[PDB]
């Protein structure tokens, strides 16, 4: 037998690598918003007053000492911070004449994928039983399994960036 399907993550032959990451970086940003947006009322500041995967991991947010915020406020601030990167044409050029900055992968793509993965961590560790009662585990796993294969294809996330789901992500590759 052979290897995978959504191995569409492979870079098309003869094309820019920064673009193939930037388009997928925007795409996973949309997919994650659809996942969390459907359980938007199962994750409230009363349910998750602290942005956490399992009680060992906690993600703070800086507005500059980073403070502890609830899960919906951390995601709301994360997505508003991602749109500041996309609207910045010096980073995500919307005109076909514009180009990417130096180190666009290490300075833009990887920092965004590090933060966006943390929404996957919160959904699995604190809302999987509620996702299970919505026929969304199929959509959640597919969107997450595609996220890891794309990050593994281009070495975008270190094992330390897979914090709580590092054991779960070992049943791939």
């Amino acid at each position: 037998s052979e290897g995978v399907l959504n191995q569409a993550v492979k870079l098309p032959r003869g094309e820019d690598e920064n673009e193939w990451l930037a388009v997928h970086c925007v795409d996973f940003y949309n997919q994650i918003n659809m996942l969390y947006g459907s359980i938007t009322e199962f994750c409230s500041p009363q349910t998750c007053p602290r942005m956490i995967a399992t009680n060992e991991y906690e993600y703070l947010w800086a507005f500059q000492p980073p403070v502890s915020v609830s899960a919906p406020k951390y995601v709301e601030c994360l997505m508003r911070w991602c749109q500041d990167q996309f609207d910045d044409e010096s980073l995500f050029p919307s005109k076909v004449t514009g180009t990417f900055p130096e180190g666009f992968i290490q300075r833009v793509i990887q920092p965004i994928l590090r933060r966006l993965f943390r929404v996957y961590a919160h959904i699995y560790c604190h809302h999987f039983n509620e996702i299970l009662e919505l026929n969304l585990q199929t959509v959640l796993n597919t969107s997450f399994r595609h996220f890891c294969l794309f990050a593994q294809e281009f070495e975008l996330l270190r094992p330390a960036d897979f914090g709580p789901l590092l054991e779960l992500v070992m049943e791939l590759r």
């Binding site: 098309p12 925007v26 995500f92 919307s94 959509v139």
Partner: protein, 76 residues
């Protein structure tokens, strides 16, 4: 919940229409590039042997396919 059930239904059918269009491009991109290489090879060893014009028409196609990929993330 009548307010969550509407968002869960549209969330599932989004990824369907999304991943279906995703594979629609990735297999059409590979089938368009397949005909460009086959056209570059079948004109490689005719006369002219234009090692630049075939190398330039190859870049012209990649740039023309590059702008297609960029517009896939710039939704109005």
């Amino acid at each position: 919940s009548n307010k969550t059930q509407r968002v869960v239904s549209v969330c599932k059918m989004y990824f369907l229409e999304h991943y279906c269009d995703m594979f629609d491009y990735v297999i059409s991109r590979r089938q368009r590039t397949k005909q460009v290489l086959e056209y570059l090879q079948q004109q490689s060893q005719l006369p002219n042997s234009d090692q630049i014009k075939l190398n330039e028409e190859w870049s012209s196609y990649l740039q023309r396919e590059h702008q297609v990929l960029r517009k896939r993330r710039l939704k109005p």
